[PDB]
């Protein structure tokens, strides 16, 4: 029931290297997940 997110923003097809990601949030939600989508900013 915990939805974890790790993240990192590192400035520079993906390149080649190693970088460990740190916890971002801790969310006691309870939510079940089986599918998801994404959102994009269009050109208008």
């Amino acid at each position: 029931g915990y939805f974890k997110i790790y993240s990192k923003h590192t400035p520079i097809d993906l390149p080649q290297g190693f970088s460990a990601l740190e916890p971002l949030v801790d969310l006691p939600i309870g939510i079940n997940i089986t599918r998801f989508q994404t959102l994009l900013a269009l050109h208008r």
């Binding site: 029931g1 915990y2 006691p28 309870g30």
Partner: protein, 49 residues
């Protein structure tokens, strides 16, 4: 279906307006939530504690 109280200051007890609040807890499924406050205790050093 609706009436209204009155409440003039010159009422006896049992007819003056009382304010009522009720608290109700429920622990559905959360792993941990709002708990009581924590009583600290300072912190000493260089001692077996």
């Amino acid at each position: 279906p609706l009436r209204s109280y009155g409440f003039r200051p010159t009422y006896g007890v049992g007819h003056q307006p009382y304010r009522v609040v009720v608290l109700s807890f429920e622990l559905l499924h959360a792993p941990a939530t709002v708990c009581g406050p924590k009583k600290s205790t300072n912190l000493v050093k260089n001692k077996c504690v």
